[PDB]
Amino acid sequence: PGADAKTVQDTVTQVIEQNMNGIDNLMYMSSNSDSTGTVQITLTFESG
Amino acid sequence: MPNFFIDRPIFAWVIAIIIMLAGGLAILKLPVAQYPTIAPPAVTISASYPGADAKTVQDTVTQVIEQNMNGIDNLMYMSSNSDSTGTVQITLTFESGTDADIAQVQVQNKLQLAMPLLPQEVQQQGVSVEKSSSSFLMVVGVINTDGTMTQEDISDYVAANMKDAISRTSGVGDVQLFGSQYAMRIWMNPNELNKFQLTPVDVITAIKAQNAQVAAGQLGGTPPVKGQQLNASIIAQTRLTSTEEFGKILLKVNQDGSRVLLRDVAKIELGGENYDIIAEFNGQPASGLGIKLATGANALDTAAAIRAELAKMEPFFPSGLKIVYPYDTTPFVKISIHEVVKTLVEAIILVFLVMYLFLQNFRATLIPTIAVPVVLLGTFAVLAAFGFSINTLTMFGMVLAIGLLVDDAIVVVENVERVMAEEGLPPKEATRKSMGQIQGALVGIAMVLSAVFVPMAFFGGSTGAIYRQFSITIVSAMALSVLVALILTPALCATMLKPIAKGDHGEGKKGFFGWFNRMFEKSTHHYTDSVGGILRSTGRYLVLYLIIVVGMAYLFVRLPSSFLPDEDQGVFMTMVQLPAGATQERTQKVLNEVTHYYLTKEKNNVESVFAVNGFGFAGRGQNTGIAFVSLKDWADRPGEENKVEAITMRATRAFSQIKDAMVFAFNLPAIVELGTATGFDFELIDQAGLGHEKLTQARNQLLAEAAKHPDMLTSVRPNGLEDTPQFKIDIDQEKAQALGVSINDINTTLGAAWGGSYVNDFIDRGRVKKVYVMSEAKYRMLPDDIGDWYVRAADGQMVPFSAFSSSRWEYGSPRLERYNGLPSMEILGQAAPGKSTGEAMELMEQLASKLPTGVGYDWTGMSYQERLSGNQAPSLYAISLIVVFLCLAALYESWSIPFSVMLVVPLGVIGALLAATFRGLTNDVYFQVGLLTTIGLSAKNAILIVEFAKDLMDKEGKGLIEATLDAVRMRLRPILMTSLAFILGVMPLVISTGAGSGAQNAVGTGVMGGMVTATVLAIFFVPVFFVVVRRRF
Amino acid sequence: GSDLGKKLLEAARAGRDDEVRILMANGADVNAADVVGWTPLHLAAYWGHLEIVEVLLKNGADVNAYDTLGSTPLHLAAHFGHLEIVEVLLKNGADVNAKDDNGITPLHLAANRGHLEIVEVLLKYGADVNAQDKFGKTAFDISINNGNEDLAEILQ
Ligand SMILES: COc1cccc2c1C(=O)c1c(O)c3c(c(O)c1C2=O)C[C@@](O)(C(=O)CO)C[C@@H]3O[C@H]1C[C@H](N)[C@H](O)[C@H](C)O1
Ligand SMILES: CCCCCCCCCCCCO[C@@H]1O[C@H](CO)[C@@H](O[C@H]2O[C@H](CO)[C@@H](O)[C@H](O)[C@H]2O)[C@H](O)[C@H]1O
Ligand SMILES: CCCCCCCCCCCCO[C@@H]1O[C@H](CO)[C@@H](O[C@H]2O[C@H](CO)[C@@H](O)[C@H](O)[C@H]2O)[C@H](O)[C@H]1O
Ligand SMILES: CCCCCCCCCCCCO[C@H]1O[C@H](CO)[C@@H](O[C@H]2O[C@H](CO)[C@@H](O)[C@H](O)[C@H]2O)[C@H](O)[C@H]1O
Ligand SMILES: CCCCCCCCCCCC
Ligand SMILES: CCCCCCCCCC
Ligand SMILES: CCCCCC
Secondary structure, three states, rough: OOHHHHHHHHHHHHHHOOOOOOOOOOHHHHHEEEEOOEEEEEEEOOOO | HHHHOOHHHHHHHHHHHHHHHHHHHHHOOOOEEOOOOOOOOOEEEEOOOOOOOOOHHHHHHHHHHHHHOOOOOOEEEEEEEEEEEOOEEEEEEEEOOOOOHHHHHHEEEEEEEHHHHHHHHHHHOEEEEEEEEOOEEEEEEEOOOOOOOOHHHHHHHHHHHHHHHHHHHOOOEEEEEEEOOOOOEEOHHHHHHOOOOOOHHHHHHHHHHHHOOOEEEOOOOOOOOOOOOOOOOOOOOOOOOOOOHHHHEEEEEEEOOOOEEEOOEEEEEEEOOOOOOEEOOOOEEEEEEEEEOOOEEHHHHHHHHHHHHHHHHHHHHOOOOEEEEEEEEHHHHHHHHHHHHHHHHHHHHHHHHHHHHHOHHHHHHHHHHHHHHHHHHHHHHHHHOOOOOOOOHHHHHHHHHHHHHHHHOOOOOOOHHHHHHHOOOHHHHHHHHHHHHHHHHHHHHHHHHHHHHHHHHHHOOOHHHHHHHHHHHHHHHHHHHHHHHHHHHHHHHHHOOOOOOOOOOOOOOHHHHHHHHHHHHHHHHHHHHHHHHOOOOHHHHHHHHHHHHHHHHHHHHHHEEEOOOOOOOOEEEEEEEOOOOOOHHHHHHHHHHHHHHHHHHHHOOOEEEEEEEEEOOOOOOOOOOEEEEEEOOOOHHOOOHHHHHHHHHHHHHHHOOOOEEOOOEEEEOOOOHHHHOOEEEEEEEOOOOOHHHHHHHHHHHHHHHHOOOOOOEEEEEOOOOOOOOEEEEEEOHHHHHHHHOOOHHHHHHHHHHOOOOOEEEEEEEEEEEEEEEEEEEHOOOOOHHHHEEEEEOOOOOOEEHHHHHEEEEEEEEEEEEEEEEEEEEEEEEOOOOOOOOOHHHHHHHHHHHOOOOOEEEEHHHHHHOOOOOOOHHHHHHHHHHHHHHHHHHHHOOOOHHHHHHHHHHHHHHHHHHHHHHHHHOEEHHHHHHHHHHHHHHHHHHHHHHHHHHHHHHHHOOOOHHHHHHHHHHHHHHHOOOOOOOHHHHHHHHOOOOOOOOOHHHHHHHHHHHHHHHHHHHHHHHHHHHHHHHHOOO | OOOHHHHHHHHHHHHHHHHHHHHHHHHOOOOOOOOOOOHHHHHHOOOOOOOHHHHHHHHHOOOOOOOHHHHOHHHHHHHHHOOOHHHHHHHHHOOOOOOOOOOHHHHHHHOOOHHHHHHHHHHHHOOOOOOOOOOOOOHHHHHHHHHOHHHHHHHH
């Protein structure tokens, strides 16, 4: 709450992403960090 | 079926082709790893409590977490350590077969609900729940060679510019930093603090206020006034980003208007999150990354990918930075694979040579050359379908199956060649008659072999997991081999073999082969003549048999058991233990001495020494260290003298000299989790709230008694740490209250200064990092320093700690252990020579029965399994024995004839024992799986001899002796052919030295020794078995 | 501080009587001290090893050795309830009124832990009932603060 995109990204988004390593069947990951301090990270997995 | 395919060679080729394609696909997509997963799943909870002692950690964190580990599925046991580095680790170990992900999430969810019960400073540090592993793919070291970077500078570089790219690298499952990214370090000076009537409490308060993210809002935010033209975010206070900004933090304004800044009472710098480890690589500051393979990944690809990533980071390195590779399993693993392919190819070449030598045509020589690779390829396919990997175990499983595969090929082809020479039957009709003689047996053989190997897949725990790898590999290979023998080989024989005139045994051939043929034709007659005489004297051979059986029993009982042999893996370890209470500086001097020895007196062999000061396995602290030694490549270390075992012995020898430090070197185990055979792992438990001191006395009592039984027990010892002096300080509540000094201020002043305190976070070049306050070193070294710290009373007066405290020395534990939620002390030891671990354990239990009231015990780790997944080996061999008997009985339509095949078992076993005993080897898994294949093959030989003999009796009305003589006459050649090929083929493994030679020797020697006696003994004994069993019944 | 000094410290702490005997025969320094200033006698007194205490005193141990915070073996014996060690030390010249750096005496410590018999022995040997620690407290103050009625009587 109250944080800008850049601050959210440096303190939250990148922190979570650097731990999303070596998960099984991960195809790709995308995220966004916005001006409402909201972060969403989506991990998409191999079919099946 | 073979008749079906004999008229449909093309359908048989189709089947062969599908199998080869499946196999080729599997070999491309199969995962590669040194070892498959073997230890039961384990989850570790880890927490730090900065400045805390073991009891504080135990009583405010460990007990609380343990008390919440309920309602989690498939838990076998739980254990924990709480120690004076301010650390706790709780390990929960689950039943084999448990889904590790589910285990981990269930633990993590129970922890989540306990977090509010934990101290603030622990909630703030966070508590990690991880899956336990001990195997790294590799360790990448990062060093600075120009003296411009400390280990802390390096670690931050690695964290900021390398770690994340490595983590994203293909096939990497996890990466661990050796060190931390920077922390903002505030080093307080109590003299300045007091000069301005400030305390660490004020420092902390100021940092919290002046280094923070503050929410504001929006201009023209909803709901707005209509007509509003602009909507924009408002940005207010954001976190500090530099040492300079922290230095300028305002602490106080004096009357004269002067300003007290944080830099006026502290030194401020980027430093480490902690300072307990000192890492050096050949005396140079070091950090690094421990890297683990992701599930299902390919070790070799991943290693190459990691190096590719490192390579493209190089151009951007600061001056002096360099990558090193002290540990990488990949080169070792490449060799294993090359050595195994080499073995399989040579085997096929030997079979080729032997076929040609005996059969003397290239067409016959082609058939096994085709059939064996088809079986192998198909085995890969089935392994891939079973979810297996290409690993050390599955690869040797294959070479252990070589005899069996080679034999199926040789048997079918040789028998067709014999039928043609004996009857002048055309190849196609010969093949029909031949398969007719052997097909039933081949099926019976497939059942018998399954009965022998499958049960091994049913052992429990870790050993079962290892046996399973051989079991399924060998059974799959064996099954494919029989299928190919019933489908492909007969069709090949019928279409590729040229006719042989009736009676032509090549005796009239010119040159070397006519000679061989004549030589061998008459050796067969000597052979039969000899069996003839033997069969007039069966009584004495029964006597010789009982002697063989007895010598087997004898040899077996005296052959020491182990798990997997040590290897020169190109690295090994040296432990450094100084007396309790020894300082980091003292430990460093020893490590330096150790390092100096290696780079000096082992300069020809040693590439590097990675000295980690402050790190232990059974304890951390300033008095423990490890020297991780990396060796030059095997090729530059010729001779037993320049191999790990030797180097290790010399090293330890040399370090026995070192004054007040236990220092020794040892090779690495193939798989840490197995411990040692002979080894046990014992837990003494406080069952009645006895407390630490009474538990200690009970422990000592037990250790003294154990030592009185050197005949049974050896090296029975504590796995943990002895109590040590600690400095007890009592706050006087009354005096503090009278002086108007708060306990909070007293306690954070003491803890912050002497133990350090994690205040909050800042942002360093874009990355979030920690801020720590603590006293500069020289003000927290000695008891006298305590009184140089002042606390501000309510009236503004500064009060020295000496005014409201008193102190004394006492003893306390630097590491408290718990087992299943109760105070405990782990005890390690091993059975004495010639003693079973079961015997050692039985005694330990006896000794434990005599300990003070309220003291219990339990077995954990390898002993926990033993007490369980080790009470199966005779029930499984009994089923095996019974099923084999049943299959044989159906094969021969007789309840007695099966005995004549089963009597063959000891014949190969005696030779395997002899070779192992003489070569100074042990009864390990390779030895054991080899016994099974050796037994399997001799059983197969006997089955065919008996089948032929019986058929001659049933069908041609032939006498018992007549039939036996003719059968053994017909079986001699194919039996010799197989033994020659297989024996020559395993010989390289026997004499091999260097990388992987440990495993190679273990597989080869037992096999070669078993095959020798099985071959030589069986050709004389199974006719005896058959004749005596028949007469009896 | 010597090979044998170190071993003597260990053996005394562990209560290994035989080892100590041999070490005494070999001249192991009875006055060896570790970092915090504890002698083998300190160790033996703390861990309650009576025989070792007696052997040490026969071999010229300093009965009034003090550690880096001024605490003696009698302090330790009295604090941890080792009655007969306390008696032996006092028989052998232990200063019944020794004050550590906090001005704390063996009496304060026995009182604090409610060791009545030890308190009586100490008084027997001339323990100063009116001695005050750095905070002005006596053993009697300690006993009423602890609510130990019996000990408070003994100390009238
Ligand atoms: C820096 O210095 C090093 C230099 C070379 C090797 C080493 C290290 C090192 O620090 C190190 C470790 O800190 C740890 C381990 C280790 O192997 C090394 C080195 O080899 C293994 C581990 O499982 C244990 O020792 C537990 O008993 C975890 C432990 O670390 C901590 C931190 C982990 N990330 C994890 O969260 C948990 C808290 O264990
Ligand atoms: C491929 C590997 C080949 C290498 C094998 C090397 C040979 C070593 C073992 C050979 C054993 C054969 O030994 C065999 O024993 C029997 C008796 O028991 C002998 O038979 C003779 O002696 C016995 C008793 O003394 C008589 O009952 C018998 O009538 C008589 O003919 C055979 O003449 C002899 O050949
Ligand atoms: C033709 C194809 C091949 C067929 C192969 C058949 C293999 C099937 C494996 C079944 C056995 C599994 O392992 C299982 O171990 C436990 C003991 O821990 C046994 O339980 C039993 O065995 C133990 C022996 O150690 C005895 O104390 C007692 O008879 C009982 O406890 C089970 O009876 C057994 O089934
Ligand atoms: C990056 C490298 C990771 C490897 C980590 C290895 C884990 C083992 C460390 C803890 C054990 C500490 O001490 C212990 O270590 C060795 C086991 O590994 C033991 O060594 C034991 O196993 C060795 C290897 O198979 C054998 O060569 C020894 O004969 C045997 O004694 C030591 O006798 C023991 O003192
Ligand atoms: C003519 C008789 C054919 C005999 C087939 C024997 C098959 C043995 C199978 C063993 C099954 C357990
Ligand atoms: C990999 C392709 C092998 C196919 C060989 C087929 C030979 C057919 C001969 C009749
Ligand atoms: C990656 C290819 C490996 C082949 C091993 C059989």
